[PDB]
Design a protein around this ligand. Structure first.
Ligand SMILES: CO[C@H]1/C=C/O[C@@]2(C)Oc3c(C)c(O)c4c(O)c(c(/C=N/N5CCN(C)CC5)c(O)c4c3C2=O)NC(=O)/C(C)=C\C=C\[C@H](C)[C@H](O)[C@@H](C)[C@@H](O)[C@@H](C)[C@H](OC(C)=O)[C@@H]1C
Ligand SMILES: [Mg+2]
Lengths: 1342, 22, 51, 502, 69
């Protein structure tokens, strides 16, 4: 706070104006919070194991009155820890121990229990655990589970205008999507007939569902339609008139009542006429007997006398029907209110297409729809229909479903039942009908209020839930016949069923994937990731551009520019900087509440639907002092659109200027200047930078780079503040400050650094200490850097001097021309750690031996192996060397005449064993940094395995002893201090042996109780050391359990150092790729007047076409930065004094006006200042905020301080001719990444390799790669040219002809180039396959 | 209309939606 | 993998075949021993070709 | 029996212990699409390889750089047979041990087997027949394939890491097929239209544009020289500027006789640069072709006429030279791009203001009901659009001619020598549209549903875009990426139906 | 239309390639259709010289030997 200790070492100069009101939260939040919610004790149905338990429980038997309920659960300590779990290969997991209660009710109750046995914590499954960094270890490999984005459960109303039927007219359909259970769809048609289909099944007329809910015809019309009252009073037809009913209709006759004619025939009834009737209160008018010819009667009508049905409900009345029901004494007739514009007569026409009548009829036709072909039954239809939407078992909307359902239906209750009710169905239909009537609107799927985000916690809960139902069937099945007190809740509940639901998820699921770890950003950008793919999601082939496209709701939640560019674009994205999961699971973003005309710093998080109505200001706005908007009108976005908004209107304002982007995009300096296409590519490639040998630091930056390094776990951050007691390349020991220290045990924090080891991507992950002996460190400071981090910042590469100019075509397209100085400085060098394996299996002929005796190898070959047959640690090896000797039995070689003479002449005994030994792949060369030997339990460990075991044994004791020693000294040094208070004897105390100190007491005080405390914790450690050593020894000596057939396994780990060579991919942060073309001597490099060459020569032509201008700015400011450095490098080399240095640096940190940096003279003028300058002499680190970043003027002014031109261009001279270059060229310092495509991976070549058995075709078996695949398109290419023979040779002798290939090869060596082609085995196989059927296929003629 | 799909329609001879008569 | 037409059987190599880079060397050793058997007397050649 | 022959026509029997239905004999033939054997894709091929490609400007148009290691493994049989043909190896085994040892003598054996022996190079999207071309191999240290720049167009091959595949023509007929059909030099013209596909690409054409160009006053203006020879002697020595207006004696040729080359000599009014370039132009081409500014369009029509007049061989050797010289002089030019190279109009801010009153005018007309909402919208959209055109044609005038220089008098004005303009004018890279986005305001973007936002992007890239402006820019990007990524696959489908029908 | 016109090809091996295989094989097998090659697709499947370009000389020379003395 107000600058840290490693901030005193080096400070990044920060342009940008806008003060940051909110700071970047924990970037790993999502991953961690969710699982914390999954596994936790929640005393209620809130999601958790508790809830998932309470769902499937209690389990009662079938009618047997045997019930099983649930008490409580617990997670046991992990069997192995995370590190051990990786080496051995098992999964990092904890036992789930759950208390169960078995009750059996006395048969023919009043409910009472014969006996209830409480089975103490039956064990079911081991659930995986998340690392502190948010990763899971499934089998020895760090894996991340990506959050999913799917359609939220609820109701959704869509259109389908256009494409359907090509008549226009649109359509309106509703869809009810539960979290679990079947889908219910409502949709219209061109005939305005409402239809319903359950799931995707056959279309059915809508009303058939209402009947299954026990609604008669009479009640369907009464729900969806209003009532037009017709009275027969005195004689001939009066009618009730609601004055609003006449809008949108033309008078069909004389409209007159109260002796006054309001409207005549042929006069449409407008707002004027309607006003007259409303104000004159005309309830009853006289109508003709012919008007009811179209009106549909509402209820049923019978003849009171004859008891016969005159007309059924929902029947069109006619002039004759009116006569037959009038003489029967009917005064009133109810008809439908039907308007072809406002309230539509839809349901009415749906009934006429309805084949059913009563509930049983509908249930039959429904049961026969879902499960057709089988005879229907009443109980079957009833059972099915009740099991669909009404069963607590087979249907749930959960909380999100019910909430959005009720919310979208304009209800009050925000939470409710998890099944569907008749009230619920009726309302949805009403809304669809309301929309067709023109009042109300349809949602859109792309809105982020309808897009829900799951995550590890939620997903595991579903899987664990699945386990409990499949175990549920069993418990009931067993509790059916159970004998009373013999069985207990163990014999019922199994492990394998439940354990396998969760195991099948984490093990293989589209959402569980290898952490992409070549790079911290890669990690951290993977752990925040969204996916619309996988189970319960769409597929690349299924969904179109609507969903892929960026939506207005994406602001501040999902990053627009970080998405993969490819088959799935917009199907991934990444999480925004400030985004957070809504309580219900939506995406909400931070905002500032603007009351009256002031911008308040209270933050308010708004979800996608929450933000809709409010008016939100811009992150970039000008306010001052009290924070009143400076301009009279300011740019804002309100509803789905952006326009200028008035001074005091705005309800809220953006929190930060960054909040729109993602950690990836937030790391691109001068992002505001790059076209979005190149920006995408930039944040996409930045994740690919393989770390380097020397972590550099970005010279040009954003200021997020600090946050990414620390929040990702690659680095090591101080737990508590203090002074460094001990610094080693291995560990770091900090003596805690007492204020931060807990009273007991005293303590020091010991950090064990990760050393050279294999990453998932086979890169090198190694930590280095960044602090010096006896240096003050404060809590939350970086103790040691990881790979690709520099002094706490994030360096994914190394910045270097770059010049833009065509150089003799060697840069032609994007190609990059790099000075030899770069490769000599070994700065772009990269370290790879590869794991190679050797397996000794079991064959029916015999077991395979790892022995060092290998047929047909010289003494030079077997040199690098020890007596046991495994290469020594540290021995440098190259391609072809034997890492592990292996030999497998193959008996009776069955040789030939000429081979027998050869052996006869040379008297060689051809061994009964063939050589399987593991040898280094062709071309890769490195140093062996390690060897592991896993052995089956029961086979005798060989020499080397034992040597290794003793070493590990010995190594374990040293580490543990090291622990105890530093720990004990740390504790006794505190006892010395407490003993000196109240009874101080300074020189006296340290004379006698330290172990006997514990006897001295103290005067009555808490200090006596402190000595007591330290005593307890001391002895605890003494024994804790003991127990830890024992466990480790057993874990070392215990034979690791292996697969079937494998007797023993040897894994060798090589550390290859690849530097850089033509063909490697290199790119800047701006989306500018390149492939190094030529490596040029320093002699030929363009140099400046000072004689200093330039490291890299880029082609300028790439800049205008792809519009990324930041890459130029990044160069310029960079140049300026190096300037401030170089200057300092001179004054430090001048050793001017603390004053001059201090003076000049201050000038830099101010820079002319109005920036947020502030600065020094709080810093200690001597020890702190001189150290800061020493770190800046390489260059002056600068921070360009994302959209707050520096400006041209600021850069030129910094260039003024630099001594370098404003143009940013200088004169350059060709190192060859020494002559000048016409025109100035731009030179500066651009940060550049080495992506890992490196050419000596991609390159492959094959002459003649192995071949596939089923069809003879080139197949790589040696990691000697199978040949290149020759396609259809490539065939056409040969056919367009006239080249027939190349094509025949391509698809015959070169591949598929088992003869022609050998007959050819012999000709190639004989020196005769020909081909004797024959027939490709593919077509030759096809003949037998065809002939294998009843088809006779012959080859005719001659 | 137009574009690459327009080309495919031409070579596919498809009779248009609201054609003329000769 | 890939959901692609790659199926397990497509990855099983043939071990009973003889590689051409080899078959050429078989045809060569014949030419070799046939050359060297001409270095002996007609009876030594007949006797060695017989044994 | 049914399940055996063709499974799925009745019950779909499922395989033992595995849920997935067992594949029957009919399913063995069938697939996606039709047959698996020849359908894409289609059998693996021996003697082949692949890797990342890089530039290699030194190459002649008929060759390509091949990694030493790739070539060793590819020609292994050739190497073995040649090694014991000359008697460097006792037998094939000893030869194998030799190349496996990489004995120094073997590299020389490979130079023999490579010399006259084309290899086939291919790229991903094999569309037209130019997708495969033959080259003469050149042994190269390093793991990257070097590809002659002039061909990169036919392949649509960038250097951003695209990889290419190599194939060896084993049989003799294939060697001669490769050399006489698929050789690089034998297809220089697109089969779609007779225009040359070997047209120089970007650096090279910027070279020739900077070469033949003229400023108003430069060292040596007005003097006279005997011939192109002494023109280069003048330039390289630093006496004369590359572009200065100068009369020099040149000798052109016209074959306008009957199969016979006429010669004619005169004093041509030209520049120094065009004089030097004339050294390359073969024979019967007139000097008229090089006397202009030589943009990318003209520089192609140069090659075409050269082909339609002198024939093939002269055109090839011509083409090589243009590339070599293009790259070379462009490097001398020191063309670059700075931030001060993008000139914003001084009048931009004013145009925006004027265009801003119209919108507030139409708004006032809509508030009073004088105009309907839709009619309002269309109006505002039009004025902003007109504004964009105004600024574009503002910055275009300023950028283009603003070089104002003095010859012996006060002033005169010519086409600007500003870096970015030369790029866009020559035809190398960049275009009036993209330049407009750099300096003048860029556009009015479009919301996903296809409507166009009525508040354009008033800023550009030389200035900053604020949050909103960038966000609005995003939809356009995303539809772009999406359209190409899906539309790439679609193009292929069209050719498929076509080649099937033909 | 192009997709419709490509449907008719005399040679069935070509048709079994891009059309629906099952139907082609049956519908041809009943009539006892005898495929003479002569086309491109079919010669590629069976693996001999394409009846165009370099191969055109071959096919020509064979086509005349056929149905001839
Ligand atoms: C279990 O997951 C598998 C299958 C799901 O099946 C399936 C259908 O559902 C998917 C989901 C849910 C995804 O979220 C996904 C994905 O997010 C993604 C790619 C495509 N990846 N690329 C492929 C390589 N390519 C040349 C670059 C683009 C995918 O295909 C998928 C994907 C599927 O296809 N990509 C990215 O997100 C981006 C932009 C970066 C990720 C980079 C690192 C490198 C990857 O994480 C590596 C570490 C692996 O993790 C994956 C390979 C997972 O494989 C394993 C073994 O771990 C694989 C997703
Ligand atoms: Mg590319």
């Amino acid at each position: 706070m107000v600058y840290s200790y490693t901030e005193k070492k080096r400070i990044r100069k920060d342009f940008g104006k806008r003060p940051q009101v909110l700071d970047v939260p924990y970037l790993l939040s999502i991953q961690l919070d969710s699982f914390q919610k999954f596994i936790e004790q929640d005393p209620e149905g809130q999601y958790g194991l508790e809830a998932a338990f309470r769902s499937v429980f209690p389990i009662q038997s079938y009618s047997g009155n045997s019930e099983l309920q649930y008490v409580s659960y617990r997670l046991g300590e992990p069997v192995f820890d995370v590190q051990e779990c990786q080496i051995r290969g098992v999964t990092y997991s904890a036992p789930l121990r759950v208390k169960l209660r078995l009750v059996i009710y006395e048969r023919e109750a009043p409910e009472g229990t014969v006996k209830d046995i409480k089975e103490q914590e039956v064990y079911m499954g081991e659930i995986p655990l998340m690392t502190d960094n948010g990763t899971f270890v499934i089998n020895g490999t760090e894996r991340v589970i990506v959050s999913q984005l799917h359609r939220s459960p609820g109701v959704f109303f869509d259109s389908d205008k256009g494409k359907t039927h090509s008549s226009g007219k649109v359509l309106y359909n509703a869809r009810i999507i539960p979290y679990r259970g079947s889908w219910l769809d409502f949709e219209f048609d061109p005939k305005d007939n409402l239809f319903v289909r359950i799931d995707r099944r056959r279309k059915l007329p809508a009303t058939i569902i209402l009947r299954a809910l026990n609604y008669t015809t009479e009640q369907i019309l009464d729900l969806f339609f209003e009532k037009v009252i017709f009275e027969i009073r005195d004689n001939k037809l009066q009618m009730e008139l609601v004055p609003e009913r006449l809008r949108g209709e033309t008078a069909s006759f004389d409209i007159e009542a109260n002796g006054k004619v309001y409207v005549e025939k042929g006069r449409r009834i407008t707002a004027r006429h309607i006003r007259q009737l409303e104000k004159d209160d005309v309830k009853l008018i006289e109508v003709p007997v012919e008007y009811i010819a179209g009106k549909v009667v509402a209820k049923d009508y019978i003849d009171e006398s004859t008891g016969e049905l005159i007309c059924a409900a929902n029947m069109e009345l006619s002039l004759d029907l009116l006569a037959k029901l009038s003489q029967s004494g009917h005064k009133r007739i109810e008809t439908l209110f039907t308007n072809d514009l406002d309230h539509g007569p839809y349901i009415s026409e749906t009934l006429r297409v309805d084949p059913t009548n009563d509930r049983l009829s509908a249930l039959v036709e429904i049961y026969r729809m879902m499960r057709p072909g089988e005879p229907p039954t009443r109980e079957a239809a009833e059972s099915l229909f009740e099991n669909l939407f009404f069963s607590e078992d087979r249907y749930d909307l959960s909380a999100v479903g019910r909430m959005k359902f009720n919310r979208s239906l304009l209800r009050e209750e925000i939470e409710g039942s998890g099944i569907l009710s008749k009230d619920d169905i009726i309302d949805v239909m009403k809304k669809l009908i309301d929309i067709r009537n023109g009042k109300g609107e349809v949602d859109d799927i792309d809105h982020l209020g309808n897009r829900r985000i799951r995550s590890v916690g939620e997903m595991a809960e579903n899987q664990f839930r699945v386990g409990l139902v499949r175990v549920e069937r069993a418990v009931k099945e067993r509790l059916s016949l159970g004998d009373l007190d013999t069985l207990m809740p163990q014999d019922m509940i199994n492990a394998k069923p439940i354990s396998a639901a969760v195991k099948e998820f984490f093990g293989s699921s589209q959402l569980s994937q290898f952490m992409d770890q070549n790079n911290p950003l890669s990690e951290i950008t993977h752990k925040r990731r969204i996916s619309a793919l996988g189970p319960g999601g769409l597929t690349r082939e299924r969904a179109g551009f609507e969903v892929r496209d960026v939506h207005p709701t994406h602001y501040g939640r999902v990053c627009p520019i970080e998405t993969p560019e490819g088959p799935n674009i917009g199907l991934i994205n990444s999480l925004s900087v400030y985004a957070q999961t809504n309580e219900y699971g939506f995406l909400e973003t931070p905002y500032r509440k603007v009351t009256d005309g002031v911008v308040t710093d209270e933050i308010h998080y708004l979800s996608a639907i929450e933000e809709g109505n409010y008016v939100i200001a811009q992150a970039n706005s000008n306010l001052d002092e009290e924070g009143h908007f400076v301009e009279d009108l300011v740019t804002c976005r309100s509803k789905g659109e952006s326009s200028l908004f008035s001074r005091d209107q705005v309800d809220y304002m953006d929190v930060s200027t960054q909040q729109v982007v993602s950690v990836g995009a937030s790391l691109i300096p001068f992002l505001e200047h790059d076209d979005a296409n190149r920006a995408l590519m930039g944040a996409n490639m930045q994740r690919q930078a393989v770390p380097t040998l020397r972590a550099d630091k970005p010279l040009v930056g954003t200021g997020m780079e600090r946050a990414v390094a620390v929040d990702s776990g690659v680095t090591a951050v101080a737990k508590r503040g203090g002074v460094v007691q001990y610094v080693d390349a291995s560990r770091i020991v900090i003596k805690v400050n007492e204020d931060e220290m807990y009273p007991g045990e005293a303590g020091i924090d010991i950090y064990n650094l990760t050393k050279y080891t294999r990453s998932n991507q086979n890169t090198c992950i190694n930590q280095m200490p960044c602090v010096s002996l006896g240096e003050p460190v404060e809590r939350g400071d970086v103790l040691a850097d990881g790979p690709s981090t520099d002094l706490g910042e994030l360096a994914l590469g190394q910045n270097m001097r770059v010049a833009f100019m065509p150089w003799n075509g060697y840069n032609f397209e994007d190609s990059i021309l790099v000075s030899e100085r770069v490769v000599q400085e070994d700065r772009f060098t990269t370290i790879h750690i590869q794991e190679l394996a050797c397996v000794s299996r079991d064959t029916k002929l015999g077991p395979e031996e790892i022995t060092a005796d290998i047929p047909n190898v010289g003494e030079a070959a077997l040199s690098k192996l020890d007596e046991s047959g495994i290469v020594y640690i540290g021995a440098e090896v190259t391609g072809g060397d034997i890492l592990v000797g292996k030999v497998t039995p193959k008996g009776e070689t069955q040789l030939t005449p000429e081979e027998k003479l050869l052996r006869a002449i040379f008297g060689e005994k051809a061994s009964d064993v063939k050589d399987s030994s593991l040898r280094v792949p062709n071309g890769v060369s490195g140093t062996v940094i390690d060897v592991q030997v896993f052995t089956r339990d029961g086979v005798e460990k060989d020499k080397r395995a034992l040597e290794i075991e003793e070493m590990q044994l010995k190594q374990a004791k040293k580490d543990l002893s090291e622990e105890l020693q530093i720990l004990e000294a740390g504790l006794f040094s505190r006892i010395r201090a407490v003993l000196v208070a109240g009874g101080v004897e300074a020189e006296k105390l340290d004379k006698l042996p330290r172990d006997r100190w514990l006897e001295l007491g103290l005067t009555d005080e808490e200090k006596q109780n402190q000595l007591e405390q330290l005593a307890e914790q001391y002895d605890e450690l003494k024994h804790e050391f003991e127990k830890k050593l024992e466990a480790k020894r057993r874990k070392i000596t215990q034979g690791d359990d292996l697969a079937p057939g494998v007797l023993k396994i040897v894994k060798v780990y090589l550390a290859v150092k690849r530097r850089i060579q033509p063909g490697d991919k290199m790119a800047g942060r701006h989306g500018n790729k390149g492939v190094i073309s030529k490596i040029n001597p320093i002699e030929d490099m363009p140099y400046d007047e000072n004689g200093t060459p330039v490291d890299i020569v880029l082609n300028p032509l790439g800049v205008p076409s792809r519009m990324n201008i930041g890459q130029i700015l990044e160069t310029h400011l960079g140049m300026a930065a190096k300037g401030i450095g170089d200057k300092i490098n001179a004054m430090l080399k001048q050793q001017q004094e603390v004053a001059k240095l201090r003076e000049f640096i201050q000038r830099a940190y101010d820079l002319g006006a109005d920036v947020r940096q502030k600065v020094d003279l709080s810093t200690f003028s001597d020890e702190e200042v001189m150290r800061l300058a020493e770190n800046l002499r390489k260059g002056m680190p600068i921070a360009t905020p994302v959209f707050d970043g520096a400006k041209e003027a600021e850069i030129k002014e910094l260039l003024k301080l630099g001594d370098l031109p404003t143009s940013g261009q200088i004169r350059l001279y060709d190192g060859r001719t020494g002559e000048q270059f016409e025109r100035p060229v731009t030179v500066g310092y651009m940060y550049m990444l080495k992506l890992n495509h490196l050419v000596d991976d991609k390159m492959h070549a094959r002459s003649t390799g192995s071949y596939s058995l089923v069809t003879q075709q080139p197949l790589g078996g040696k990691a000697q790669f199978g040949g290149q695949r020759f396609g259809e398109m490539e065939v056409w290419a040969l056919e367009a040219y006239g080249a027939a023979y190349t094509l025949q040779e391509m698809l015959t002798v070169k591949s598929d002809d088992v003869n022609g290939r050998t007959k050819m090869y012999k000709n190639i060596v004989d020196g005769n180039h020909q081909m004797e082609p024959g027939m490709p085995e593919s077509f030759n196989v096809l003949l037998k396959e065809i002939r294998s059927l009843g088809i006779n296929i012959e080859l005719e003629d001659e | 209309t137009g574009g690459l799909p327009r080309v495919a329609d031409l070579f596919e001879a498809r009779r248009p939606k609201e054609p003329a008569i000769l | 993998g890939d959901d692609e037409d790659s199926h397990l059987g497509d990855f099983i190599e043939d071990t009973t075949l003889e590689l051409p880079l080899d078959s050429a060397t078989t045809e060569s050793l014949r030419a070799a021993t046939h050359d060297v058997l001409a270095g002996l007397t007609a009876r030594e050649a007949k006797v060695l070709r017989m044994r | 029996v049914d399940a055996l022959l063709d499974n799925g026509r009745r019950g779909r029997a499922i395989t033992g212990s595995n849920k997935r239905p067992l594949k029957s004999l009919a399913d063995m033939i069938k697939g996606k699409q039709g047959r698996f054997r020849q359908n894409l894709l289609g059998k693996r091929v021996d003697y082949s390889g692949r890797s990342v490609i890089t530039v290699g400007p030194y190459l002649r148009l008929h060759q390509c750089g091949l990694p030493k290691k790739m070539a060793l493994e590819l020609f292994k049989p050739f190497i073995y047979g040649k090694l014991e043909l000359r008697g460097l190896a006792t037998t094939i085994k000893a030869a194998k041990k030799m190349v496996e040892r990489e004995e120094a003598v073997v590299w020389d054996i490979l130079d023999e087997v490579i010399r006259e022996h084309p290899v086939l190079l291919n790229r991903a999207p094999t569309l037209h027949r130019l997708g495969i071309q033959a080259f003469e191999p050149v042994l190269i240290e390093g793991k990257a394939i070097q590809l002659h720049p002039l061909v990169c167009a036919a392949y649509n091959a960038d250097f951003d890491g695209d990889q290419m595949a190599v194939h060896v023509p084993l049989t003799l007929e294939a060697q001669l097929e490769a050399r006489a059909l698929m050789m690089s030099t034998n297809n220089i013209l697109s089969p779609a239209n007779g225009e040359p596909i070997i047209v120089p690409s970007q650096d090279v054409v910027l070279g020739l544009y900077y070469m033949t160009r003229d400023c108003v006053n430069a060292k040596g203006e007005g003097m006279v020289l005997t011939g192109p020879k002494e023109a280069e002697r003048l330039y390289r020595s630093g006496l004369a500027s590359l572009h200065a207006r100068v009369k020099v004696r040149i000798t052109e040729y016209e074959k306008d006789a009957n199969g016979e080359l006429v010669a004619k000599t005169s004093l041509k009014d030209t520049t120094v640069g065009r004089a030097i370039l004339w050294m390359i132009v073969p024979k019967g081409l007139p000097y008229s072709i090089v006397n202009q500014a030589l943009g990318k369009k003209a520089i192609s029509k140069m090659l075409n006429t050269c082909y339609r007049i002198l024939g093939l061989k002269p055109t090839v050797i011509f083409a090589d030279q243009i590339m070599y010289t293009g790259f070379a002089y462009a490097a001398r030019s020191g063309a670059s791009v700075g931030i001060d190279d993008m000139v914003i109009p001084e009048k931009k801010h004013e145009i925006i203001s004027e265009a801003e009153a119209e919108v507030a005018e139409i708004q006032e007309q809509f508030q009073s009901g004088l105009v309907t909402a839709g009619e309002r919208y269309n109006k505002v959209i039009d004025i902003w659009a007109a504004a964009n055109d105004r600024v574009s044609k503002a910055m275009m005038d300023n950028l283009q001619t603003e070089t104002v220089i003095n010859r012996d008098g006060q002033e005169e004005k010519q086409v600007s020598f500003n870096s970015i303009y030369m790029m866009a004018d020559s035809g190398a890279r960049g275009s009036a549209a993209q330049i407009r986005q750099l300096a003048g305001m860029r556009g009015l973007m479009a919301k996903p549903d296809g409507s166009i936002i009525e508040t354009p992007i008033t800023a550009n890239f030389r200035e900053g875009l604020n949050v909103l402006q960038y966000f609005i820019s995003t939809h356009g990007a995303r539809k772009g990426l999406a359209d190409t990524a899906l539309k790439t696959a679609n193009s292929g489908y069209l050719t498929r139906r076509l080649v099937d029908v033909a | 239309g192009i997709t419709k016109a490509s449907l008719a090809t005399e040679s069935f091996i070509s048709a079994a390639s891009f059309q629906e295989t099952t139907r082609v094989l049956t519908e041809a097998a009943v009539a006892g259709k005898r495929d003479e090659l002569r086309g491109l697709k079919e010669n590629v499947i069976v693996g001999r010289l394409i009846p165009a370009g370099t191969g055109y000389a071959y096919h020509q020379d064979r086509m005349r030997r056929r149905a001839a003395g």
